[PDB]
Amino acid sequence: GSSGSSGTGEKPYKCNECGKAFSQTSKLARHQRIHTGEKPSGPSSG
């Protein structure tokens, strides 16, 4: 019913690039890696 699981709390460590909310900082970074253009891109995603 609801788009994804997004409860309440503190998600200030969200990706300022795309806008993804993670549980912790370590998670955010591990993701921001896809923004540095280092990893091998695949499908079309903004």
Question: What is the binding site for Zn ion (CB under 5 A)?
Answer: 15, 17-18
In angstroms, what is the minimal distance from the CB of 7 to Zn ion? Answer: 20
Closer to Zn ion by Cβ: residue 10 or 39 = 39
Which residues are within 8 A (CB) of 17 and not within 5 positions of it... i.e. 6 or more apart?
A: 32, 35
> Which of 8, 42, 11 has its CA nearest to residue 28?
11
Closer to Zn ion by Cβ: residue 1 or 46 = 46
Closer to Zn ion by Cβ: residue 17 or 29 = 17
CB 14 within 8 A of CB 22: yes
